[PDB]
Curated annotation (Swiss-Prot), chain A:
(-)-2'-epi-GR24 binds at residues 58-59, 142-143. This is Strigolactones hydrolase CXE15. One of its GO terms (cellular component) is cytosol. The keyword Cytoplasm applies.
Length: 299, 306
């Protein structure tokens, strides 16, 4: 008996088996980063070149570096930012429930450090400029945003050769039992309250609640943020998103808490993933515009 | 350090870089969480509740260093198998060299079988594709392309790790399609004209990336006949079927193979050669006379073994 059914593409059974179902620049190739679980990431280098870790979305239950509009976005950041993109796959729920994805995220960083301490052996594209941007900037779409937060909070000097500078949080997938105002009311194209709940049910540990940490940063079990020092962040949200106020309430709290540098930008009437979905739309290039600044002012 | 066709680059430091026939419904699932390995199931739509369907585990090729269940002609082949054989097809991914050297792939192969047993017992049968369908786990058949053939040789449940008699699921036959076998001494075919696809140096490459560091081509995981490999006479083997192309560089290897098993006591081994054909002619050139023939022997091979 289907215990859970995510749009038909994911079927978690009662017993628990889980069933499943435009121009060109830049250059890209793939590699392993974690052998015991066989996890691979992809590198993008703009070719026009003379690091941006992208964690893809999918509410922790869908997504792959190979996916089209995930890939399409990765080329766009790479080219226009003149940037090396690191787009890893992370383990997916319900087969791999949280904190699986977060553990894998930390593994991505470790791989970068181990490639950096390699005595700068390009080991990616030898025809290359040593560390176009040693400065690294995490960018998280949907669920990917949640990883970026957990990666700030975790690294409050670990992996010294590599220094996270900024955190881009793009429609971050945050949780909580109390809906606020965006969740209630109008379901988006593709995004409905029950669907966001589903994502959580499949993602978080069995028996957990939406206010569990790794979902709500301000849940009872979640840690205190004021003490911990954060790196400068950037939250981008669509006006029509169901996670609009979640990311506002988030940003609101961080900025009002002291010391943390958090910028917040809304795009009016846009739905989740207007970036890396309908690219080359004015809104998209604007996102490009802001992240560039976010990084050059964070240089 | 090594460069397979440009698509795979094993560097000096451990570092590896890379680059609608219908009639059947299909979907994917996990079978091994610790290694995060996925397989695909194919179930015929022509099924009008005919009988209990047999199982066909298809291990894809790629010389243990390439391949995926999602790949086009691998996927296409699995669809043809299911349709023509009226059978459940199980197309798993196995770990790939040089990142995962052997026996990684063989261990993963065993995990597929154990998984299907956990999907024979504990129901699961038909909970996959709700279409009313009976699954005859008593009639299982392994099918191996290229490297997949090598997988098929091992995993002969007896020749395998203990034979865990996975009752109710029971393998009946093993189809070995241009099996990727090894050995230091070359035989005529290896030394003749390299194919459009397969070249002698390329097969050496495949082996170099695949087998454990320092090992030789006569390692039991490449050569089934010595020095370290088992006797084979002692262990009782299931009936097998070897298919090879006339022009293949592993023509004599699989013939020498078939010759030897067949020359042993009891073992049932059939051998079929397709004249002037290259490796993977069944996959690369489907709906060809040769291909459609291939699906007619495997059918008979299954129905005689049913």
């Amino acid at each position: 008996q289907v215990a859970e059914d995510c749009m038909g593409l994911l079927q978690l059974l009662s017993n628990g088996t889980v069933l499943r179902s435009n121009n060109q620049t830049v250059l890209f190739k793939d590699s392993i980063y974690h052998k015991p679980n066989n996890l691979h990431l992809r590198l993008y280098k703009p070719i026009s070149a003379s690091v941006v870790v992208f964690f893809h979305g999918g509410g922790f239950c869908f997504g792959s570096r190979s996916w089209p509009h995930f890939h399409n976005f990765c080329l766009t950041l790479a080219s226009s930012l003149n940037a090396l993109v690191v787009s890893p796959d992370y383990r997916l729920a319900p087969e791999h429930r949280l904190p699986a994805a977060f553990e894998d995220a930390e593994a991505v960083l470790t791989w970068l450090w181990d490639q950096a301490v390699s005595d700068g052996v390009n080991h990616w594209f030898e025809d290359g400029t040593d560390v176009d941007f040693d400065r690294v900037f995490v960018v998280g779409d949907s669920s990917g945003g949640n990883i970026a937060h957990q990666l700030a909070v975790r690294f409050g000097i670990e992996l010294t050769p590599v220094r996270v500078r900024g955190y881009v949080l793009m429609g971050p997938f945050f949780g909580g039992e109390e809906r606020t105002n965006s969740e209630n009311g109008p379901s988006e194209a593709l995004l409905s309250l029950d669907l966001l709940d589903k994502f959580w049910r499949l993602s978080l540990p069995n028996g957990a609640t939406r206010d569990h940490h790794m979902a709500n940063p301000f849940g009872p079990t979640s840690p205190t943020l004021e003490s911990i020092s954060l790196e400068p962040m950037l939250v981008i949200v669509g006006g029509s998103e169901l996670l609009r106020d979640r990311a506002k309430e988030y940003a609101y709290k961080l900025k009002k808490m002291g010391g943390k540098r958090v910028d917040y930008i809304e795009f009016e009437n846009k739905e989740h993933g207007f970036y890396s979905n309908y690219p080359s739309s004015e809104a998209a290039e604007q996102v490009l515009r802001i992240i560039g600044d976010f990084m050059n002012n964070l240089s």
